[PDB]
Structures are given as C-alpha cells and as structure tokens.
C-alpha cells in the first residue's frame, strides 16, 4: 500500500491540498518534532523506564 | 481576526478547569 499512499498524496496535492503557508508550520513544526523524536526521545524513554519505574520498585 | 464577541470562549474554560483539576487530583507522587 505504499504506492497507494504516494498516489493519494499526489492526488491530494493536485486537487485538495493547498500549498499556502505550508512551509510555515506544516513542514517546520513537523521537522522540529522529527528532530526531537529521533534525538532526545531515545534518552527520554530511558528517563521514563530506567528512572521512574525502578525508583518506586526499589522503594 | 481581531478578538470580539467574547461569549462562549470564556465559558468552556471553566468546565475544562473542572475536568483538568479532577483529572490531576488522581495524579499523585
């Protein structure tokens, strides 16, 4: 279905999706979120599991 | 664009305050 998603995106860009103020927040905000997830979120998962859980377990 | 009217925007926030405080009261350290 990857080709299906690509074709649906192409049709949306052709007809429905409007390229106005898209680079403002649709691209920039999503890119910032991607950088956050691929970056410090790996450490955030550790800060959740190996810190919050084990503390109350030890207690 | 500019904010006018000011009728129902300021009314739902009190209900959301009730919901948020009820939700966070369950949260505990």
């Amino acid at each position: 279905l990857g080709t299906g998603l690509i074709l649906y995106l192409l049709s949306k860009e052709i007809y429905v999706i409007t390229a106005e103020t898209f680079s403002a927040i649709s691209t920039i905000g999503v890119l910032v979120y991607i950088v956050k997830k691929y970056g410090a979120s790996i450490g955030a998962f550790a800060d959740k599991l190996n810190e919050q859980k084990i503390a109350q377990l030890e207690e | 664009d500019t904010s006018t009217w000011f009728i129902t925007i300021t009314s739902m926030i009190m209900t959301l305050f009730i919901l948020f405080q009820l939700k966070i009261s369950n949260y505990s350290y």
């Binding site: 279905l1 080709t3 299906g4 074709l7 649906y8 192409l10 049709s11 052709i14 007809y15 | -």
Partner: protein, 43 residues
Amino acid sequence: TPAEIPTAIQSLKKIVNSAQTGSFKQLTVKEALLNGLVATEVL
C-alpha cells in the same frame, strides 16, 4: 500527468474494505467472471 494512478489502488482498497465488512459474499458472481476474463487476458 496521470491523475488516475490512485484510482486502481482506491478500487483495491474498496475491495479490501468490502471483504472486511463480511457482506462481500452477497455480491453477484458477475465480478468473478470479469476478474477471470481479465486474468485470462494476461495469459
């Protein structure tokens, strides 16, 4: 530029959804005959 590319995949997804619904058995056998003819065309 071919804007009809997504159409076939949309039809495939519609068929998949119809299969998921469970009432797809209620359809006529004409579609099966058409599918057989189209498959035989490649042969």
